[PDB]
């Protein structure tokens, strides 16, 4: 199985990418 | 619960997307 810390660590990366995928789209649209 | 294989399988997708989100931004910025 997998520990809670590893799952929470991966959750931060997913949230961070969700911000960048929209910042990049907004930056280039400008 | 969830097995280690499924967590590691999802880890590859997150890493792959992290590369594409920057390649796409760099390709369009060029």
Write a structural description.
Chains A, B: This is Outer membrane protein SlpA. This is part of a larger assembly, with two copies of chain A (30 residues). Chain A has 30 residues and is an all-alpha fold. The first copy, chain A, is built from one helix and no strands. Chain A is rod-shaped and about 45 Å long. The first copy, chain A, starts with a helix and ends with a helix.
Q: If interface size is counted as residues with C-beta under 8 Å from the partner's C-beta, which chains form the largest one?
A: A-B, 13 and 15 residues
Q: How are helices and strands ordered from N to C of chain A?
A: H
| Strand tally of chain A | 0
Count of helical stretches of chain A: 1
The assembly state of the depicted protein chains is: part of a larger assembly
- SS class of chain A: mainly alpha
Shape of chain A: rod-shaped
Strand content of chain A: under 5%
Distance between the termini of chain A: 45 Å
| Whole-angstrom Rg of chain A | 13 Å
Q: Specify the helix fraction band of chain A.
A: over 70%
Main beta sheet of chain A: strand number and arrangement?
none
PDB class: structural protein
Keywords: SlpA protein, structural protein
Entry title: Structure of trimeric SlpA outer membrane protein
Chains A, B: S-layer protein SlpA
